[PDB]
Amino acid sequence: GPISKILVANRSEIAIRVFRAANELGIKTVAIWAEEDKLALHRFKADESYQVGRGPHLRDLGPIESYLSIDEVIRVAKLSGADAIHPGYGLLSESPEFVDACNKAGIIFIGPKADTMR
């Protein structure tokens, strides 16, 4: 099945840049946000958004730490039903461990394969 819901594992302008492309393609979008990003516009630009890094399921992760949590990102991808993740740039975009976790969850990693990265 072609990609129909993308979670952007990122924030700020790159997350918005990817939401725009996805929406233009008719693809659903999912944002993530740390508590510190509760007012960040990228989260209001996706079709739905979910907090990462805080809660009963943890300590509170730091502002940037929340976005580097492979476990949190995968949790929200499953929760939202995202079938692909775009890592944008920076953050987890060159983590083979992250690509591996995506592969394990059956979620498409939008970028090169894990072995390519290593």
Partner: protein, 121 residues
Amino acid sequence: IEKGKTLVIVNQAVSATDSQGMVTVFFELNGQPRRIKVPDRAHGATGAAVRRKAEPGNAAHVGAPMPGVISRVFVSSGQAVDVLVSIEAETAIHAEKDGTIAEVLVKAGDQIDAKDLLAVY
């Protein structure tokens, strides 16, 4: 409001009751200012929203082009195409057509906002 649609709401400020019996709550909603007016029912303002309110359509309605306080009313029953009221911020609001005005909702040394209904033909 639904799953994945979380609003962040902050109470920034609450105004004094205004001359219309309305209190403005200045909210921040998802980071953006939103002003919401409600009647001050607590202080006896049930029956309140007060000032109409011009319809951009009709001809009929004399709507304020701008916010201010009215400085002079020049009319209360009909003529020409003539200064009807002035607004200080003085302008100088003219009748757009021939007619008989059948209502003057001002008033004034009254404060008004653009689109408030000033007079009706």
